[PDB]
Amino acid sequence: PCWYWDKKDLAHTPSQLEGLDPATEARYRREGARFIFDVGTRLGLHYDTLATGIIYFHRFYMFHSFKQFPRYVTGACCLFLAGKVEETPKKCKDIIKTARSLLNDVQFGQFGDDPKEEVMVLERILLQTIKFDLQVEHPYQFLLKYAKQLKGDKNKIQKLVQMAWTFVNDSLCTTLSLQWEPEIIAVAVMYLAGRLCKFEIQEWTSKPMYRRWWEQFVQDVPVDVLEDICHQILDLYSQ
Amino acid sequence: ESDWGKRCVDKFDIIGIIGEGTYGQVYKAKDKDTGELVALKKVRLDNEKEGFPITAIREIKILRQLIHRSVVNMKEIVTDKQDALDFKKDKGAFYLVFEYMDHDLMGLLESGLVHFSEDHIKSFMKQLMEGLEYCHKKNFLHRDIKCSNILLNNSGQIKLADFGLARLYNSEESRPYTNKVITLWYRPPELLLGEERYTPAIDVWSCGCILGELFTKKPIFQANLELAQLELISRLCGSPCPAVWPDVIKLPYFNTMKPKKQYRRRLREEFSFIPSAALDLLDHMLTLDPSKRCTAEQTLQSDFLKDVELSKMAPPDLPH
Ligand SMILES: Cn1cc(-n2cnc3c(NCc4nc5cc(Cl)c(Cl)cc5[nH]4)nc(N4CCOCC4)nc32)cn1
């Protein structure tokens, strides 16, 4: 199945059609992704399991509205299901306990009287929404695979990875995971990290003069696509 | 086509239950739209026990990653009852859909109307170990191999099915896994002694019980409890002792579960009627020490299976 939309479609999500302005939905997506990232980290969950639940989160609200399904309840259900997918399962009672410690009692009120039942029930329609497409790849495995082929300054390359790695964490709060494949996001965070560090990434490749260094990793990717991804990531720091 | 789970199970015409699988019964159904024959496994949602079964999630993740001749192919997934328009109330189930195979190995051995020649066993064991080796290379354990989980078509094609207890194993690192896996009659000794850090050698043992059963037309280890099961394994393969298995003292139930006597290995004399090429394979597959037990790749290199050209396969005939 295809899990990638255009920017014109991201402006007409089920939440947009029900009256929610694009500013608040983009905020609920950030808060939802930040929730899954913070709850799973406190549970000591692997970085692929965190990104899997967040991708389940973004993919969910492309077919359902924020007005019908609370974001923190769905965000909890995504992390619960993601743990069982990536063979890092956590008890649902342990996710609720971690959620009520982070969320305010007003924010935690979305789980209702029975927080456990509210998440188990949502799992049925969550699987249907994700269409039982459990296997999901993330830009991390490609960021490491591409950068490992780079020969040069071990310090400048290591700084490039730890900086692009942070950019992938920031990209989870946006709809970039719904626009471009993980291989493209992995290349984009390298392109951005090479600009701010003032690093010439092409000089660490087999072709030191060829300016489009990423063509050995991904095929048919113009520079304007990378610029679009870098613009959306830089919008997170301007706020 | 790609929107699994949306399709309702009423789009299928369930015909009848055909067997008992991992997490429930197996149904035989005909698609009301395509007219094709399929098999259905119903997964339940306990809602008070971590919801959707991780074992079902494992089988879904694994079967959507495997493409092989000797493995079952999951077709789609359908839902039970349409939601009461408050989804908080819908408490139905899902149905895993599989391709339908003409025969199962359990019914063939039980009928007595069928007799497998040597070439029939060489063909069935070849396809079974080729499929198990592909899963072990992909870092996947079956953890449940029995005669009802081995399917056979009229073309002589063997396929392994029912991955309900399958999971991933770390190839370059030891990891604790679930102990209560594999049926009692096919469970290796190390699992009976409570080993949680086991190897892919547990599936080779079950296939070893299949090989011996293909000749005797009856399971070789039929007991009703864990202690009696270790008793029957000891009377044939010898009692588990540090001489045959030095790492056996690390097992939790070594001093707890002990046979009545320290039996010797009488496997080669009990199955003397078996051809010599198959007895050497059976003796190596039913080794107590899983580290000294042969792997799936080694079975394909044994004299009983190395020169078994699968093509020109002649299956036995038990017709209408
Ligand atoms: C998990 N999984 C299973 C399948 N699968 C596909 N094809 C069959 C199949 N086809 C032969 C067959 N055996 C039959 C026995 C009876 Cl009593 C009747 Cl009435 C009709 C029969 N047809 N049998 C079985 N079972 C055998 C019994 O134990 C459980 C599995 N599983 C099958 C696909 N995925």
Residue numbers in the entry:
A (entry chain B): 22 to 260
B (entry chain A): 716 to 1035
What does the literature reporting this entry say, word for word?
In addition to the cell cycle-regulating CDKs, the transcriptional kinases Cdk12 and Cdk13 have become the focus of interest as they mediate a variety of functions, including the transition from transcription initiation to elongation and termination, precursor mRNA splicing, and intronic polyadenylation. Similar to Cdk9, kinases Cdk12 and Cdk13 have been shown to affect the regulation of RNA pol II-mediated transcription elongation through their ability to phosphorylate RNA pol II CTD Ser2 residues. In addition to regulating transcription elongation, Cdk12 directly or indirectly affects several cotranscriptional and posttranscriptional processes, including RNA splicing and processing, and DNA damage response (DDR). The small molecule compound SR-4835 was introduced as a potent and selective reversible inhibitor of Cdk12/Cdk13, leading to deficiencies in DNA damage repair that in combination with DNA-damaging agents and poly-ADP ribose polymerase (PARP) inhibitors result in apoptosis of triple negative breast cancer cells.
We determined the crystal structure of the human Cdk12/CycK heterodimer in complex with small molecule inhibitor SR-4835 at 2.68 Å resolution, indicating a specific interaction of the compound with the kinase N-lobe. SR-4835 occupies the adenine-binding pocket of the kinase with its central purine- and pyrazole-moieties, while the dichloro-benzimidazole moiety of the compound sticks out of the ATP-binding pocket and winds around the first β-strand (β1) of the kinase N-lobe. Hydrogen bonds are formed between the backbone amino and carbonyl groups of M816 in Cdk12 with two nitrogen atoms of the central purine moiety. Here, two H-bonds from the hydroxy groups of residues Y815 and D819 form a clamp to the two nitrogen atoms on either side of the benzimidazole ring. From the top, the two catalytic spine residues V741 and A754 of the N-lobe interact with the central purine and benzimidazole groups, a typical feature of type I kinase inhibitors. Residues of the β1-strand and G-loop I733 and G734 interact intensively via hydrophobic interactions with the benzimidazole and morpholino group of SR-4835, respectively. The αC-helix of Cdk12 is indeed turned in by 23° relative to the Cdk12•ADP•AlF3/CycK structure. This rotational twist is accompanied by a downward shift of the G-loop of more than 5 Å, thus occupying the site that would be captured by the terminal phosphate group of ATP in an active kinase. Similar to Cdk2, the αC-helical turn allows formation of salt bridge interactions between the phosphorylated T-loop residues pT893 and arginines R773, R858, and R882. Of the embedding 815YMDxD interaction motif within the hinge region, the key residue Y815 is replaced by a phenylalanine in Cdk7 and Cdk9, rendering these kinases incapable of forming a hydrogen bond via the side chain hydroxy group with the benzimidazole moiety of the compound.
